[PDB]
RNA sequence: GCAGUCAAGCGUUCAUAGCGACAUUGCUUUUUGAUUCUUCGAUGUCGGCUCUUCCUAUCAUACCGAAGCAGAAUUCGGUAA
RNA sequence: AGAACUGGCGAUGCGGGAUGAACCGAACGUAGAGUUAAGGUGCCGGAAUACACGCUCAUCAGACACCACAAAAGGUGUUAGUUCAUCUAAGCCGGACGGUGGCCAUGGAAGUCGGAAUCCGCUAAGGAGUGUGUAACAACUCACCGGCCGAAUGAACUA
C-alpha cells in the first residue's frame, strides 16, 4: 500500500502422496513489498479455493516491470470496493505510462472520492486500452485529440526568501 | 429495429420507385388530423402517399445513391415535410384530382416531381406545339 | 472533471467596435457605446478578425464554465443595444382608480411619477436611469416605452417602475392592479 | 481607434515539441522537450541532448520555455535527438537572456576571493569614467 | 373593466406561478425545484392557488 | 413538553390551503421518574414583593411569502428577541 | 446496578491526548552524548507555509481514537460510478392521431363521473368568425404548427 511494484505470485497446495504435483495458481498483486505481495496472494487464494497458507506453498514470486515504460498508454481498470454502506462494481479509466503508476492513482482516487481506503478495494482487471475510441471517458479522450495544446494560466512561483522587494506576476 | 424501421422507409420507398414511372413530390409541409387521408384510399389505385420523419426521409435518399440518380434532383426540395404520390399519367390532370381535396385558407401542394423536372404542373404535350413550331422557330427566324 | 478548454463565440457586426483590455470590455456602434467591467470572472477573450471575437476558458470546471456563456451574452447584448438598441414596453392595468403617470424632475433629475394607484393619496417616484428614454405610446392606451442600448438599464427601470405599484394587504388574484411589462424588443427593426 | 483590439495572453503552451527547462531532481538545470501530454499536471519528456532520460514528469517540476521545434507526437529519443539538432535548440536558448543570466550568475559564483578583489578594482575605474560623464550632458 | 387581456398580462406577474410547500416561495410556474436554501432546495412545489 | 419523514384519510370535488391514522426518526431539560457523584464539624424550604439580565419554541409591534386570501376578519409560513 | 477473563487506577511520577486517577507511549538511582516512542512540525511552540493525486465553498463549512453526540428523510450543488435503452444503417427543434358521445351508466362522459374492455384504422390543417366596428357587413390577424439537428444521447439509480 503505497509506491507501488507489480507481482507474479504463484503458489500451490502442499503435495500428499495421495496427489503429488497439485495444481499450480498464479495472481498477478500490485502491492509495496513482496511480504504484501504474498500475504495478498493468500487472502485471494482463500476466497477462491479451499486452502490456508498453512496447507499450502508459494513457489515464486518475481516482480513484472512494465514492457514499455515510456510509452503513454490509456488503461482501463476495473475494480470491486465497499462503501459505507455496501459494495459495488466499477470501470475508469486512467491515462499513464505503466500499470504501476496507473494502480496508484487509481488508490488515490478512490480514497478522494469515494472514501475507500485501501483495505476496501479489489482490483479486478486492468488493461491497456488498445484502439482509441474504445475510450469510453470523456476526461481521458479529452487528452486524445489531434495537436493537443493548452497554456497553464496563472503561475505561481515558490519564493526562497520571506520578503520580495518586487510586486510578484503570474505570467507564465 | 429502429434502424430496421428506418431501413423499413429506405426500403419500400426505393420499391416504389421501381414500381413507378412518374413520381409527384406534393409538399405536405403543415397540415394535419383527419380529412385529406380518407379520400386518399379512393385516390390509392393511382399512388401512394407516405408521410413522415424528416431525417429519416433525409437518409432513404442518402441510400439511394447506388443507382435511378435523377432522384438526386428531388433532394434541394426534401426541405420541410413533403410527400409522394407514386404515379403513372396525367401529371397535370389526374394531378389536379389528387390535388382537390378541398383548400384551406390548394391543400398544399408546393413542389413538383416530374422525372427529373419540376413544372407548375400545367404544361407537358397536349398539341405537340413546342416540337412542330418551336423546334423550328429559329428554323423560322432563320432558314 | 476540469475541461481542458471550452470557448464561445462572439460575432461582431459591421459598424461595430469592440475593444477589451483586462477585461474591461468597450462597445462602439452607430447608436452609441457601452462599456462593462468584467474582471470577477476569468476568461480570455482573443480576436479572430474584426467580425469575430473568441472567448474561452482553460481548464476550467463546471461552475467556471457556466461563467462563459455569461460573459458571451453579456457581450452580445452590448453589440445589439448599440446596433438595434432595446426597448421594453409598459401597461398600466387597473379596475376602477385610473393609474396617473408623468415625468417630473428635481435638479434637472427626472422622475417617473405615479398617481392615484388604486386610490393613494401617495406619490411614487422611480427615477430615471441615465441612458434610459422614457416615451408614452400615441395610439396604445396607458402604454409607457422605455429604451436605449442598455438592456440592463431600460429592463431595470421597467423592474423599477413595476415594483413600485404592488399592492399590500389586497389578495393580488382580485387586486390586480400594477405597470407591466407587455412587450420587449429592440428600437430599430420593426416592432 | 476604429479596429476592435484585443490583446491576448500569450501563454507558452504545454505541446509536443514544446521545449522546457527542468527545476528540480538531478537533471536540474537542463532543456528537455514535451513529447506526448499525459494529463493536466503530467507530460512525456525527453533530453537526449543535455542527457535528460526519457520519463514522465510532473509540470510543476519543469518550467516552460519559449522555445518549441517541430516533433511528431510519441517520437522516440533517436528521433527526438535528430529533430532537436535539426532545430538547433541549443542555438536559441544560449542566445535568450534568460541562458545568458543563468550563466551569469554561474561565473560569478565561481569567483576567487582574488577575482572578486579585481572585480571591485574595476567596478571602481568603470565608475570613475562615468560620472565625470554623467555630468557632461 | 380590465381588458381580458390585460388581466392576462397582470396574471403572469400575480397569479401565474408555483408556490414551495414547505418554505411557501413564490416561484416559477413551470419551475421543479424551489430556489431556496432554507428548505433544502426541495421539489415539493404546488401550483399557486387560481381565484373563485 | 416540542419538531419531523411516509401519506391512508379529512377537507362538497381535491392526499399535503389547513389537517392527518397506521407506523417511524428525532429534539428539549421550567414535568415526573430512575441514579446516589458532591455536600449531614451544615449550601438556610414554598409563595410573594423588589430588580437586572439571558433564551426563543414569537403573544403584540416592523417588512414579507401562503390560503379553501373578493372586501373586512382570520389562519399557515419567513427574516425578527 | 450486577457477574466473566485479562490488563490498569488505587500505591505512580515521566512523554502525548490543551485540560484530565483509569486512554496512547512508556514505568522512575545521580548525570553526559546519541536514538526513538505515542504525538507532532503556519504562528503561539521544538520541527518542511515539504512533495504528490483528487475532493470540498457552507448568509450555521471543516479540522483526528477513548472524547466531550446527532437521525429518519430530502437537494437539477459538485464529483466519480452502475443498469437499461437510443445511435456511424451527448443530443437537439416541431408531428402524440381517426372509425366508434364505440359496448354497460348518463346534460357531455370521450382514453378524458363511473363499469367492462380499448378492436380496427392511416399516412397531409381556413373556427357560419377572436376582437374593433354594425341589429347584422367590410378590412387586418391567428388554431392537430416548427427549421429540427449533428459521436454522442435518454431514463432510472449508487455513494
Ligand atoms: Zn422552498
Not at chain 3, 74 to 90: H, S
Request: a positive charge; charged letters at 30%.
Amino acid at each position: 500500500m503505497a509506491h507501488f511494484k507489480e507481482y507474479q505470485v504463484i503458489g500451490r497446495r502442499l503435495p500428499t502422496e495421495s496427489v503429488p504435483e497439485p495444481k499450480l495458481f498464479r495472481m498477478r498483486i500490485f502491492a509495496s513489498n513482496e511480504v504484501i505481495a504474498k500475504s495478498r496472494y493468500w487472502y485471494f487464494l482463500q476466497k477462491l479455493h479451499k486452502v490456508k497458507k498453512a496447507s499450502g506453498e508459494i513457489v515464486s514470486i518475481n516482480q513484472i516491470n512494465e514492457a514499455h515504460p515510456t510509452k503513454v498508454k490509456n488503461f482501463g481498470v476495473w475494480v470491486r470496493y465497499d462503501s459505507r454502506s455496501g459494495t459495488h462494481n466499477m470501470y475508469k479509466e486512467i491515462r499513464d505510462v505503466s500499470r504501476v503508476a496507473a494502480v496508484e492513482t487509481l488508490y488515490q482516487d478512490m480514497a478522494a472520492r469515494h472514501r475507500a481506503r485501501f483495505r476496501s478495494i479489489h482490483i479486478l482487471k486492468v488493461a491497456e486500452i488498445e484502439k482509441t475510441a474504445d475510450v469510453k471517458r470523456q476526461y481521458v479522450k479529452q487528452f486524445l485529440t489531434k495537436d493537443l495544446k493548452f497554456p497553464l494560466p496563472h503561475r505561481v512561483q515558490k519564493s526562497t526568501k520571506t520578503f520580495s522587494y518586487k510586486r510578484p506576476s503570474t505570467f507564465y | 429495429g429502429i434502424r430496421e424501421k428506418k431501413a423499413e422507409y429506405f426500403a419500400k420507398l426505393r420499391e416504389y420507385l421501381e414500381e413507378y414511372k412518374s413520381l409527384f413530390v406534393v409538399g405536405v409541409d403543415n397540415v394535419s388530423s383527419q380529412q385529406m387521408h380518407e379520400v386518399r384510399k379512393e385516390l390509392r389505385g393511382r399512388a401512394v402517399v407516405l408521410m413522415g420523419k424528416n431525417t429519416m426521409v433525409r437518409r432513404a435518399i442518402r441510400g439511394f445513391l447506388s443507382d435511378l440518380p435523377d432522384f438526386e434532383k428531388l433532394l434541394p426540395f426534401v426541405k420541410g415535410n413533403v410527400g409522394f404520390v407514386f404515379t403513372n399519367e396525367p401529371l397535370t390532370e389526374i394531378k389536379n384530382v389528387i390535388v382537390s381535396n378541398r383548400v384551406a385558407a390548394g391543400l398544399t401542394v408546393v413542389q413538383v416531381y416530374d422525372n427529373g423536372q419540376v413544372f407548375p404542373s400545367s404544361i407537358l404535350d397536349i398539341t405537340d406545339e413546342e416540337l412542330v413550331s418551336h423546334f423550328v422557330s429559329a428554323v423560322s427566324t432563320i432558314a | 472533471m476540469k475541461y481542458i478548454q471550452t470557448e464561445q463565440q462572439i460575432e461582431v457586426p459591421e459598424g461595430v467596435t469592440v475593444s477589451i483590455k483586462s477585461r474591461i470590455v468597450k462597445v462602439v456602434g452607430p447608436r452609441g457605446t457601452l462599456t462593462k467591467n468584467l474582471k470577477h470572472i476569468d476568461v480570455t477573450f482573443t480576436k479572430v478578425n474584426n467580425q469575430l471575437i473568441k472567448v474561452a476558458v482553460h481548464n476550467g470546471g463546471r461552475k467556471h464554465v457556466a461563467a462563459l456563456r455569461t460573459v458571451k451574452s453579456l457581450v452580445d447584448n452590448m453589440i445589439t443595444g448599440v446596433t438595434k438598441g432595446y426597448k421594453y414596453k409598459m401597461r398600466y392595468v387597473y379596475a376602477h382608480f385610473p393609474i396617473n403617470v408623468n415625468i417630473v424632475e428635481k435638479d434637472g433629475a427626472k422622475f417617473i411619477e405615479v398617481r392615484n394607484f388604486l386610490g393613494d393619496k401617495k406619490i411614487r417616484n422611480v427615477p430615471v436611469r441615465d441612458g434610459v428614454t422614457i416615451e408614452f405610446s400615441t395610439n396604445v392606451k396607458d402604454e409607457i416605452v422605455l429604451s436605449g442600448n442598455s438592456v440592463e438599464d431600460v429592463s431595470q427601470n421597467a423592474a423599477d417602475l413595476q415594483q413600485i405599484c404592488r399592492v399590500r394587504n389586497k389578495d393580488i388574484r382580485k387586486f390586480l392592479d400594477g405597470i407591466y411589462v407587455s412587450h420587449k424588443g429592440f428600437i430599430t427593426e420593426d416592432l | 481607434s476604429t479596429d476592435s483590439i484585443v490583446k491576448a495572453s500569450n501563454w507558452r503552451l504545454v505541446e509536443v515539441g514544446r521545449v522546457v527547462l527542468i527545476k528540480k531532481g538531478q537533471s536540474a538545470g537542463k532543456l528537455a522537450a514535451i513529447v506526448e501530454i499525459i494529463d493536466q499536471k503530467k507530460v512525456l519528456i525527453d533530453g537526449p541532448k543535455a542527457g535528460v532520460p526519457r520519463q514522465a514528469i510532473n509540470l510543476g517540476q519543469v518550467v516552460l520555455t519559449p522555445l518549441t521545434f517541430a516533433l511528431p507526437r510519441g517520437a522516440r529519443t533517436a528521433t527526438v535527438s535528430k529533430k532537436w539538432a535539426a532545430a538547433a535548440v541549443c542555438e536559441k536558448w544560449a542566445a535568450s537572456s534568460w541562458a545568458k543570466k543563468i550563466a551569469q550568475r554561474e561565473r560569478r559564483a565561481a569567483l576567487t576571493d582574488f577575482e572578486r578583489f579585481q572585480v571591485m578594482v574595476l567596478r571602481k575605474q568603470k565608475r570613475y569614467t562615468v560620472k565625470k560623464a554623467l555630468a557632461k550632458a | 373593466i380590465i381588458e381580458p387581456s390585460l388581466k392576462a398580462l397582470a396574471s403572469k406577474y400575480n397569479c401565474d406561478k408555483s408556490v414551495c410547500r414547505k418554505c411557501y416561495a413564490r416561484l416559477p410556474p413551470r419551475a421543479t425545484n424551489c430556489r431556496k436554501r432554507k428548505c433544502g432546495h426541495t421539489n415539493q412545489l404546488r401550483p399557486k392557488k387560481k381565484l373563485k
